[PDB]
C-alpha cells in the first residue's frame, strides 16, 4: 500500500509459488552402441597406404 | 400483420375478459472474477526473463 497505517480489509501482497526440487531427465533405453571394438580391438589393422 | 383499428369519433372498445399472463426476463448480474500473475504469464518460471 506504500503506507504505514493499514486500514481494515484484505489485500493482495505476494504470489506464492511452489518451487521445483529435482531436475528429472528421461531418455529411452540406451541401445545400439556404435561399433568400436571391431576397430579398437583388432589385430588386422589395415596398411597405411591401404 | 396488417391491422386497421375501427376508429370512429363516437365508438369505443372495452374489454370484457382478461388473461393473467406471466412473462420472463433474464438479466446477467455478474461475470467470472479472474486474477493474473505476470511472473508466471509473461516470464513463466524463468528468473532470467523476469
Ligand atoms: C364524426 O364521424 C363521422 C363518421 O360517421 C363523420 O361523418 C363526421 O364528419 C365526424 N365529425 C366531424 C365533426 O367531422
Ligand atoms: C374469460 O375467459 C375464460 C377462459 O379463459 C372463461 O372461462 C370465462 O368464462 C371468461 N369470462 C367471461 C366473462 O366470459
From Swiss-Prot, chain A:
Superkingdom of the source? Viruses
**Positions bearing carbohydrate:** 21, 23, 29, 41
| Listed result of changing residue 29 to Q | Reduced viral infectivity
Q: Where is this region: Disordered?
A: 17-33
Task: Tell me, in a sentence or two, what this protein's role is.
Answer: Attaches the virion to the cell membrane by interacting with host receptor, initiating the infection. The major receptor is host ACE2. When S2/S2' has been cleaved, binding to the receptor triggers direct fusion at the cell membrane. When S2/S2' has not been cleaved, binding to the receptor results in internalization of the virus by endocytosis using host TFRC and GRM2 and leading to fusion of the virion membrane with the host endosomal membrane. Alternatively, may use NRP1/NRP2 and integrin as entry receptors.
Note the subunit structure: Binds to host ACE2. RBD also interacts with the N-linked glycan on 'Asn-90' of ACE2. Cleavage of S generates a polybasic C-terminal sequence on S1 that binds to host Neuropilin-1 (NRP1) and Neuropilin-2 (NRP2) receptors. Interacts with host integrin alpha-5/beta-1 (ITGA5:ITGB1) and with ACE2 in complex with integrin alpha-5/beta-1 (ITGA5:ITGB1). May interact via cytoplasmic c-terminus with M protein. May interact (via N-terminus) with host bilirubin and biliverdin, thereby preventing antibody binding to the SARS-CoV-2 spike NTD via an allosteric mechanism.
Q: What is this protein called?
A: Spike protein S1
Q: Which organism is it from?
A: Severe acute respiratory syndrome coronavirus 2 (2019-nCoV)
Taxonomic classification: Viruses, Riboviria, Orthornavirae, Pisuviricota, Pisoniviricetes
**Protein's gene:** S
Note the residue range shown relative to the complete protein.
Answer: 303 to 352 of 1273
Amino acid at each position: 500500500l506504500k503506507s504505514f497505517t493499514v486500514e481494515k480489509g484484505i489485500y493482495q501482497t505476494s504470489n506464492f509459488r511452489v518451487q521445483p526440487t529435482e531436475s528429472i531427465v528421461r531418455f529411452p533405453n540406451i541401445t545400439n552402441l556404435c561399433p568400436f571394438d571391431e576397430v579398437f580391438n583388432a589385430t588386422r589393422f589395415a596398411s597405411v597406404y591401404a | 400483420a396488417e391491422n386497421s383499428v375501427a376508429y370512429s369519433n363516437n365508438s369505443i372498445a372495452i374489454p370484457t375478459n382478461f388473461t393473467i399472463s406471466v412473462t420472463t426476463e433474464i438479466l446477467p448480474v455478474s461475470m467470472t472474477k479472474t486474477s493474473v500473475d505476470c511472473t508466471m504469464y509473461i516470464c513463466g518460471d524463468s528468473t532470467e526473463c523476469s
